[model samples]
Structures are given as C-alpha cells and as structure tokens.
Target chain A: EVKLEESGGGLVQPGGSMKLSCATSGFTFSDAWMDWVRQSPEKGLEWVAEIRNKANNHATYYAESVKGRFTISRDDSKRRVYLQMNTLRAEDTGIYYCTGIYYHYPWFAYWGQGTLVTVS
Target chain B: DVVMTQTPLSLPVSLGNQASISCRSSQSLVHSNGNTYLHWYLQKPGQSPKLLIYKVSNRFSGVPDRFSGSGSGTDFTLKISRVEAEDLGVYFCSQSTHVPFTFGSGTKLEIKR
Candidate 1:
C-alpha cells in the first residue's frame, strides 16, 4: 500500500519555527504534487501550501492566508517532502497532514497519518 | 477563492441509518473544461482524511458504494446509506474548481448507540 510516514517536532514556543516531514513509499514522489494541510480549532481545516517538482518544472503555491509563514518543499531523490512554518503562533497548534495528488488531478489520493504539534 | 459552506456542524444518526451532508460553494464549481471538482472526504478520529468521492460523484478506489456524492456547479451532497460503525467521523466537502482549494467546515457524524 502507498504510505506517507509523517513526523514533526511535538512542541514549539510562540515566535519559533518548525519543520515537518513526510517520507513517501510505494509511489514516484516527484510525479505527484505534495500539499500541507493543517487543522485547528480556530480555522478548521486549512490548505497551507503545495509544492510540485515534476520533471524539470518546479512550482509552489502558499495559501494567501499564510503566504509568508508556510513553505513547502520536496527532495525527489529522497522521496520526501517537508513543510516549514516560521514565526509560529498559539493558533498554529493543530494536527498537520501531508496529502498527495496526481499532477493533473484535483483530489488528494493519499494522506499521512498526521503530526501533532503544539505552540505553547 | 471559493468558499465551501457545509451544513449541520453536528449530526446524530443511528447505526444502519442514512445520512446526508450538504456542501454549498460560493461560486460555480464547473471548470472551463466543464468538469466539477467537488470532492468528499472522511476523517476518522486521530487520523488523516481519506478521500471517498471525487470529481463530483465518482467514488475513489476502496470506498464502499454506500458512500456517494452528487450535484454540480455550486451545490453538492454526500450521502452515506446504511451507515456503519466505522463511518462515524467527520465528513468534509472540498472544491478544487477554483484557486486556494478550499474545504468545508466539516460535519461531524455521531452514531447513537
């Protein structure tokens, strides 16, 4: 079965930054688009950002609401993707998930178990 | 940005009953190529969401036929017939027809024992 093993730093103080990771298996990492989604009591489920590194073309999109805070990147060779959030706030506390979608498809076909992070 | 408005923030249903969740988008979900990118997801407790339906009404692989999606343009519905114990969770409706890729507030499904 295709899997995304995700991990993250359990806790972070306000103003600090954190990087979460998702290691993929059973699929070609670069052929699919990776996305970061966060769920919080305040905002519900929000699409933080997405990164595509298929072939020689590379593209990234950060939600307008968190353009400067959320950054998504991937290492095709390692079959891994990462999400870095800067200047974290208390509201950033949530279970963050990494989802994968086909290049031309809109629906997320795969997802990580999720990483729980708390902003103290 | 498209806003997906899901209703009945909380739902209580008996086992084997049918449940319907509604998702209304702020704008038309039909793309220029005439495709509706409305999708449905189920997130179990302490787990990431799983795709149940995609492209308006098609069920994703492994999803049971009881989980169905319908409608187009702006208004959509996800119906789960003969709900099972494993189906108790949060159901979310998302729209990919527009940028920002928004999701509904989510409807929680609670099985009344």
Candidate 2:
C-alpha cells in the first residue's frame, strides 16, 4: 500500500520556524512532483509550494503569497520530503498535508494524513 | 491563479438519493495540451482529501462508478448517483491548468435522518 507519513510539526512561537516531513513508501520517490498544502478553518485549502527533480531542472514552484517564506524539498535516499517555513505567524496554524503529483501529471494522486502546526 | 466557487455550501441528502455539487471557475480550465484540468475530491472528517475524479470526468483509481464528474471550461459538476452513509463529507473542486493551483471553498454533504 502506498503511503505518505507526515510528521515533525507542532507549536511554534510567532516569528519562528517549523519543519514538516513526509516519509513515503510504495512509490518511486525521485520521479514525482511533491507538494505541501495547508488547510485552515478560515481559509480552506491553500497550496504552499511544490518541488521536483527533472532532467537537471530541479524545479520548485511556490505560491505567490509565500514566495520567499516557505520551501519544499525532498531527499530521495531517505524516501522523504520536507516543508519548512520561516517567520511564522498565527495565520499559519493549520493541518499541513503532503501530496504527490504523478510524473508529468497535473493532479495530486497521493496524500498524507497531515501534520498539525500551531503558531502562537 | 484561478478562483473556484462552489455552490450550496451545505448539502443535506437522504441515503439512496442523488447529490450534486456545482463548481464554477473564474476562467477556463483548458490547458494548452487541449485537456480540461479540473478535478474533484472528497474529504471525509479526520481524513485527507481523496481524489474522486480528474481531468474533468475521469474517475481516480478505486473510486466507485456512482461518483461521476461532468462539464468543462469554467463550470463543472460532481454527482453521486446514490448517497451512502460514507458519502457524507466535504467535496472540493480544484484546477491544475492554472499556475498556482486553486481549490474551491468546498461543499459539505450531510446525510439526512
């Protein structure tokens, strides 16, 4: 069974930072475009960033709102992906989900249960 | 970025009855590849959003035939031919044709007693 197990998120003081990880299994980690999406009661689901390694491209796409504040990356050796953010604010409190876009496909086919992050 | 709007934010349906959700996008969702990139998802409480349909009307793996998607361009619909207890959840319509992918506000479906 394919799975994306997310962890490493918790309370963070305002203006601080947080890092979330998704350990994947049952899929080729290096061949997919991975994404981090956040969900809040007030704002719904928001796409934060995505990363992929193409033919020497090593592409990364960020939402305009978090262009410089967030980062998405992956380590193929460990079959894990990460989402990190700096200068966090209260509005960042939500459940962050890890997802995967099939190679060259536009839609998300795999997802993690989500890691909860709270900014106080 | 595209904006997605879903109607009847809260839906109440009886078991065995049909349910429909409407989503309208701010612009067309046709990609240069000549395919519509609109998709549908269902987020059950305490669970991650699961892909139900993709590329307008194609069902994702393991999704039942009772769930169907239709329409193109700026408007789309997701229909459940017969609502079941497990069908109660929040349904969202999202687009990938646009750069900064966007999702709808979502429609909550509840089973009527």
Candidate 3:
C-alpha cells in the first residue's frame, strides 16, 4: 500500500507557469509511473497524462492538437516530479492529483491528497 | 476533449436494493488498440475511495461482484446488485481514452429512509 500527497505550490504568475507534484513513500518510485488526474466542481475526475521512467516519455491523448504547453516531468532524487501548466486559462482552474501506477495499469492505486490551482 | 455525461444526479435506494448510474461519452471510449479505458469508482462519505470497475466491466482487486460495470463506446452503467448501507455515497464514471480526460458529474447514492 502506497500513499501520495499533493499541494498547491501557489498561483501561477500572469504569463509565468506553475507546477505541483505528488510525493510517494512506502513504495519504490522506480516500480511505478506517476500519472496526473484532474477534478473539479464542473468535471469530476480525469486523466491528464503520465510520465514513464523509460525515455521520460509523456503522452496526451486529448485536446488532440495541444502540445508543449502542459508537461509532466520526473525527478528520481526527490521522489517527485512536478506538473507544469503554462499559458493558463480560467478553465484550467481545478483540483489536481498525482497518482502512482502499478501492475501495468494506471488506476490511481496511490493518490495525492489533492491540490487546488486557480488560474487568474 | 471527450465529454462524458452521467445521468440522475442522485439515486436513493434502501439497503439490499439495487442502484444504477449511467455515463455517456461524446467520443468512443475505445482506443485504436481495442482497449476501453472507462472506469468507475465509489467515494464513501468521509472516506478516501475504492475502485469498483476498470477497463469496462472488470472489477478491481478486492471489489465485490455486486458492484458491476458494463458499457461500450459512449455509454456505460454501474450497478450494485445488493446495495449495502455502506454503499451510500457518490459514484463517478470516467473515461481515459483521451487527454484532459472526462468524468461524469457523478450520481449520489443515498439511503431511502
């Protein structure tokens, strides 16, 4: 059993980007992939994207044309990688979660407490 | 971004009674690889959460069969055959085939007092 925690680093600067991360303990970080999910009063819970240790690969299956603006990165040293959202929009405001993957399936086996980000 | 819509914001049933919730996605949840990444979850009041279903009708580890999920492409349903008192809470359905993924607003399962 593993647990994850999330916190709002703070509000993003007008044109600057910001990030939040999920920290995991009780489980080896190398054993699982870190996935990002979003929740809000408007939309319940969603899969944003995930990063894999191999090649540091990341893939987004939605907003088919969107690229390079939203990124998920990893840091083995801190056992945490941050979610950076750039060129923010009001609609981007919501609760975000970092989840740990296991058993080859990414079902949020371990989840962060959740952090709220408001894009002004 | 795909849009997933769930109906009946709230469902009230007594213990042992059955409860059902629906989810519909604007785009097919099936991926080109033939995998449906749709999932269902139960969030009990004051508790963290539990996965009821994953990849369509498959139950998560330790999940009771009483909680079943079934659907294809754009529509799905979560059924609890024998709702227990502990089942009262909010249930949500989500699709993972796309980024900026989508989730049903959710259906509240309350006990009919």
Candidate 4:
C-alpha cells in the first residue's frame, strides 16, 4: 500500500526557481531508494537524480542534463522528497515524478502521481 | 547512453485480439552481475506509468497475466494475449542495466473497437 504524490505548480517564471515536493507513505521512508524523473510535453521520460540513502545528509547522483540546476533532497521525518530546480528555463516545463526502487532492484516499482511544472 | 527503439510507434487492435510491441536496445541489457535490467511499463491516458514486466519475463505484482514479456539481449517483445479496452495506452520498454537508463519512444496501443 505505497503511494507517492508531488505538488508544485502549473507555471513558473523563467530564471526563477521552484521547489517541488513528493509526499510518500505506506512504507518506511528511511529505507527507500528515492529518485526523481520528468517528462516533457515533447520528450519522453528522463531520470533527473537519485538519493543514495535515507539517513541524515545522504549523497545524491544527478543526471548530467539537470545536474547544474537541480538538487535532490529529502525529509525523513516528513516522509517527503524535495526536488529544487534553480535557474528555471522554458525547457524545464514538464511533469515531474518521484519514484522508488524496489529493494536493491534497478527498476522503479513505485511512482508518484507527478506534478505538472511549466515555465513561462 | 543506451538507446531503445520501439517498432510501430502506434498500434490499433480490436478487443480480444492479440497485440505485440517490439523494443530493441542499442546494446545488450545484460549486467555483469548475471542480471538483465530490462523492464516494461504501461501508461494509460491521464495516469502515471505502471510496471507491467521486469527483468525480461517477470510480471509485476497485480499486472494481468494477459501481459507477457519475452526476448533477450537487445531484442524484446511485449505481447497482449487478448486486448481489452483498458489496454489502450502507451507502452514503454526501459533498460536499467547501466547508469543513465533509457526508455523507448513508446508504443501507443489503441482499441479498434
């Protein structure tokens, strides 16, 4: 009984930043391999980044496409993940998803409902 | 980066009919650890994508048995035994054998009615 939901916005100002959130439940938050993926209106799914741990101050791996402008973090107590994109661009408009890997498997077993983010 | 190519970008099938979507990868998806990280997913209209098959032929929990995946190395196929209305959607084949995983452009399945 696991589910993920992200909340953000339908629009954002170019050159500004927006913080997206993924609220999770029905599982242990501290032990899940959380990742962020996005799909643009014209492009397919793209892996943005992934958190390597649920402990305090975990390491992160960012995709080269969004590495410079994106940051992935989490709040263990709140059971949520934070995906902050700085210096937003028109190309950043898309639906963002927070996903969970099943145990150590590489496949994404659980996914968030996704938040629609559009940059003006 | 691994490139996944899917055939027949869109498919129209009559209900109860059989359908197959093919996906081919640029390289073999076999991992050095004796695992192939190929997976299949279905994304219905206005819904998020759901795992249908994993590691080649293993069906994800709750997925109908009508959905089956087969093939190895760089070629893969997802077969629908009996197409249903609910099966209309975009099917994607993803490879997780290496970092920076990639997904096929997607094969859209429509019900012919």
Candidate 5:
C-alpha cells in the first residue's frame, strides 16, 4: 500500500525555475530509491533523475538531457523527494512523475499521480 | 542511451481478438550479468503508467497471463490474447541494460467494437 504524491504543476515562464515535490508514505522512505520521470506527446516517456539516500552513502543519477538544468534531492524528515528545473524552455513542458523503487531495481512499482507542467 | 522503436504505432482490435506489438532496440538489451533488461508498461488514458512485464518476459505480480512477452537479441514482442476493453491504451517498451534508460515511442491500442 505504498503511496507517492507529487505536487507543483501548471505554468512557468521561460528562464524561470520550476520546483516540484513528491511525498511518500506506507513504506520506509530512506530505504527506497526516489526517481523522477516525465512524458510528453512528442517524446513519450523520459527518465529525468533518481536519488538513493542512505545513512552513509548517497547516490544520484541524471539524464544527459537534464544534466545542467535539473536537480534531484530528498528530505528524509519529510519523506519526500524534490525536483527542480531551471531555465525552463517550451520543450520542458510535459507531465512529470515521481517513482519509488526498492534498492536499485528498475521495476518502479510505486508512482506518483504526476504534475502537468506548461512552459510558456 | 538505448534507442527503442515500436512498430504499428496504432492498432485497433475487436474484443476477444488477439493483438501483437513489436519493439526493436538499437542494441542488444542483455546485461553483463546475463540478464535482459527490457520491460513493458501500459498507460491507460488519464492514468499513471503501470509495469506489466519485466526482465524481458516475466510478468509482474498480479498481471494477467493474457499479456505475454517474448524476445531476444534486439527484437521483442508483446502479445495480448483475447483483448478486452480495459486493455485500450498506449504500450511502451523500455530497456535498462544501459545508463539513461530509454523507452519506445509507444503503440496505441484501441478496441474496435
């Protein structure tokens, strides 16, 4: 019964930064990997970034397309993962998703409701 | 990043009929650990996506056997036997064998009355 809820959607102007949020419950927050994914009518599904926060080891990975513009971070106290995108472009408009994975597995069983971003 | 391509971008199948979708990767999806990293997903209209198949052909828990997967090397196929109204949606194929995991363009499935 894992639940992932994503927030922050709607409009963003070019050159502005957009901040999104994902909160989780019904599972151990720090033990699971938080991943960011997005989809658009033109490109379909795209992997954005992922973060795994452990007591001693914290690892993160980002897609080449978002290397310089996107940031993925987590807040263990809040049981949430955050996604930030800067210098927004029209191409950045899409539906953003937050997924939870156990360890490093790729199945991504838990997913957030998603936020629709419109960059104008 | 692996490039995934799916054929018959859109299809219409009547209820109780069978349908097949093809996905081909630019490179082999086999990992160094001797496992194929290909997976399948279904995104129904106005809903979040869900995992249907993983590691090439293994159905995820609770998935119907009517949804079958099979493939090797760089080619793969997802077959839906006895299509139902609930199966109408877009199907995407993805690969995790390489970094920056990639997904196919997707095949849109429709139920023809």
Candidate 6:
C-alpha cells in the first residue's frame, strides 16, 4: 500500500512555521505527482497545491490564494515530499492530504490517505 | 483556472435510497490527452476522505459500484445508487486539468431517516 506521512511540529502556535511530509511506498517516486489539500473546521475541503518531486526534479504548483507563503520540497532518498506553511494562522487548522498521482492514460489514478494538521 | 461549482450544497437522503449531486466548472475540464482530472471524494463526517471516483468515470478500489461518477468537460455528476448509513458524508468534485487545483464547495449528505 502507498502511505503519506506528515512529520512536523505539533501544537503549532499561531504565526509559526510547520513542515509536513508525505511519504510513499508501493510506487516509484520519479514517475508521479503529489497534491496537497486542506479542510478547515468551518470551511470545506480546499485545494492548496501540488508537487512533482521526482529524484532531482522538483516542481510546484500553488493556488493563487496561497501566494508566496507556502513551500513544497522533497527528499527522494526517503521517498517523501515536504509541505511547509509559514506563519500559520488560526484559519489553517484543518486536515491536510498528500496524494500521489498514478497516470494510466492521462489521469492520476491513485492517492494517499491524508494527514491532519491542527493549528492553535 | 476554472471554478468547479457543486449544487444542492446540502441534501438529506434515506438509507437504501439513491442520492445525486451535480457539478459545473467555469471552463471545460477535458484535456488534450482525452482525459480530465475530475474526481469525486467522500469525506465521512469526522474521518479521513476516500476517493470514490477519478478521471471523471472510473471508480476507485474498494469503492462500491453504487458510487458512480459521470460527466464531460465542464459538467459532472456523482450518483449514489443506493445510499447506505455509511454513505453519509460530504461529497466534493475537484478538477485539475487547467492549473493549480480547484474543488467544489461540497455537498453535505445526510441520512433523513
């Protein structure tokens, strides 16, 4: 099975920076893309961005709403991609998902279970 | 970027009954590759989400055939042929063919009785 692990600080204080990771198995890291999603306490599920981190090639696509404050990086040695949100706000409290893309004709067919991020 | 809008915003259905939701995007989701990245997800009340459908037509692994998704370009529909108690949740339609990502506001599904 493919898995995504979010590793970062817990009980994050407002205005702090937290880093989350999505680790994967049962697949190759160099042939797919990963997406990030957020679901707040009051807000519905929202798309944050996505990353294509394959070995030495790392690319990012962020929604306009996220602007320049968020960053996504990866370490292929560990088969993981990191999502870093800077200056966390109370509005950032929500569940985050890191999904791996498996293209079989022209679409991503697989996704990883998401992780929860709680910001105080 | 296209905006994917889901209507009904909320609905109440009885278990064993059928439920349906609709989605519309500002621009067509069809990619030149003959595929669209439109997907549907079921987020149970207080749990992690599961992919119910992907590529606008195929059902994900372990998902019941009851959860059917059909659509083309800017219009999409997700049908629950037989709503179960476990089917109570919020459903969202998402598209990624244009750029970045976009998700519908989501339809809250509840069991009426």
Local accuracy of candidate 1 as per-residue lDDT tens digits, B1-113: 78888888998999999999999999999999888899888998888888889987998878898988999778899999998888899999988778778889999999766
Instruction: Report the alpha-carbon TM-score of model 4 versus the true structure.
Output: 0.93
| Residue range A28-104, candidate 6, lDDT tens digits | 76776777777766656666877775553677878666658789776767778778898888888877777656545
lDDT per residue as tens, model 4, B79-113: 99989888889999999997877789899998765
Please provide TM-scores computed only on chain A for all of the candidate models, following their numbering: 0.89, 0.90, 0.77, 0.89, 0.90, 0.79
Q: Which residue runs does candidate 2 get wrong by more than 4 Å?
A: A54-56, A103-105
TM-score of 2: 0.93
lDDT of 5 by residue, B1-113 (tens): 78999998998889999999999999998889899989999998778888899887889878899999999989999999999888889999999888777899999999765
The residue pairs in collision within model 5 are: none
**What does candidate 3's lDDT look like per residue over B1-113, in tens digits?**
77878888999888889888888999998888899999887887544445678898998878887988898988898889889877778887877677554678789998878
Per-residue lDDT for A17 in model 6?
Answer: 83
Per-residue lDDT over A1-120 for candidate 5, one digit per residue giving the tens place of the 0 to 100 score: 778889998899988898999988888787877889899766788888988768636688898777889899999989889999998878788999998566336557667889999988
> Candidate 3, clashing residue pairs?
A61-B99, A62-B99
Q: What is the lDDT of residue B106 in candidate 1?
A: 96
Scoring each candidate complex against the real one, what DockQ results? Answer: 0.83, 0.80, 0.39, 0.79, 0.71, 0.49
Q: Candidate 6 lDDT, tens digit per residue, B29-94?
A: 888877788998787755666778988878887888888889787889999988888788888888
Higher-lDDT candidate of 4 and 6: 4
Computed on alpha carbons, the lDDT of every model, listed in order, comes to 0.85, 0.87, 0.73, 0.86, 0.86, 0.76
Q: Write the per-residue lDDT of candidate 2 for residues A1-120, one digit (tens) a residue.
A: 678889988999999998899988877667777889989766899888888756436688897777888888888789888988898888789899998776335567678999889888
Model 5 segments more than 4 A misplaced: A55-57, A103-105
What does the lDDT read for residue B79 in candidate 4?
95
Off by over 4 Å in 4: A54-57, A103-105
Error of 5 at A90 (Å): 0.5
